[PDB]
Point group: none
Chain length 167, copies 2
């Protein structure tokens, strides 16, 4: 026989682990990215009443969150570890990059770098490509949010089904 108490302790450890490794991770990714965009969203509001003052804030924000990783946070990680997550997030969301010897998942700056690389037929085309890279972020943010709101629901339901398993 087993114990009946070692069991509850068993589920308790898993709950705490599922949260620290999975739940809390997603939250960071969302918060970080959500933060970055919540700032770029400013460069979009400022450039309204406005290629230097813009191209500046672009390289300035590109500096802020340039050292703000989605994973980890305060703590560093592995190579084959920053990849499985890179894929879990969506790949197009972050780009793994070595750090002080370790390896972390850094927010992909493909959009920003591309907008700066370009900083009627010259505007109607630029405001089309630049704004096309804006939605890419607006999207990557939503997908990440939905895929986070999923882990939450999944988690909650499994926890209930597990604690309800006894008794």
């Amino acid at each position: 026989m087993i114990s009946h108490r070692e069991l509850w302790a068993k589920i308790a450890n898993s709950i705490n682990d599922i949260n620290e490794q999975y739940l809390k991770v997603y939250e960071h990714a969302v918060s970080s990215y959500t933060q970055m965009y919540q700032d770029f969203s400013a460069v979009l509001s400022s450039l309204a009443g406005w290629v230097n003052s813009l191209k500046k804030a672009l390289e300035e924000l590109k500096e802020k969150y340039k050292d703000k990783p989605l994973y980890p946070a305060n703590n560093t990680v592995s190579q084959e570890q920053a990849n499985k997550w890179l894929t879990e997030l969506g790949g197009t969301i972050g780009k793994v990059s070595q750090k002080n010897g370790g390896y972390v998942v850094s927010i992909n700056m493909t959009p920003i770098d591309n907008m700066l690389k370009s900083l009627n037929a010259k505007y109607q085309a630029w405001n089309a490509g630049f704004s096309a890279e804006d939605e890419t972020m607006k999207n990557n943010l939503q997908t990440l949010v939905q895929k986070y709101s999923n882990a939450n629901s999944i988690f909650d339901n499994l926890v209930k089904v597990l604690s309800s398993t006894i008794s």
Copy 2:
């Protein structure tokens, strides 16, 4: 009580096994159906969306083959509920599921004295209305016609989601029982 009791590995599987059956029977056999139904109902509405593209010409349309086609879907899904697949259930339970589905998807309707979550047809009813209350008046009708169609495509994808999650839950349950032997 007094205070911990003890089970045994085989007894352990029995527990996990029941949870899985209960969950499956009680949960995802419930979702798998609701999706199968709504998905079917929509595909049938998507079969008309193509036909409609043939009743538009200059721009006049055959509002007869239309509505008399919409009312043909209603009749087909008037006795097809999202839950329960068979028999009826308490009004308190039928409502509990109305929420789990999204609320805007189905409508709990009394049947035989009991209850059952019947797929909401109010959008189809919104089309039949506007379809009988008759490039400026057409832009409007179609505008509100493609709006209701967007209210169905949404209800599905969002229902298809909660289902995918129901699967994961089950999938995770299985891993536990499997990762318990060994």
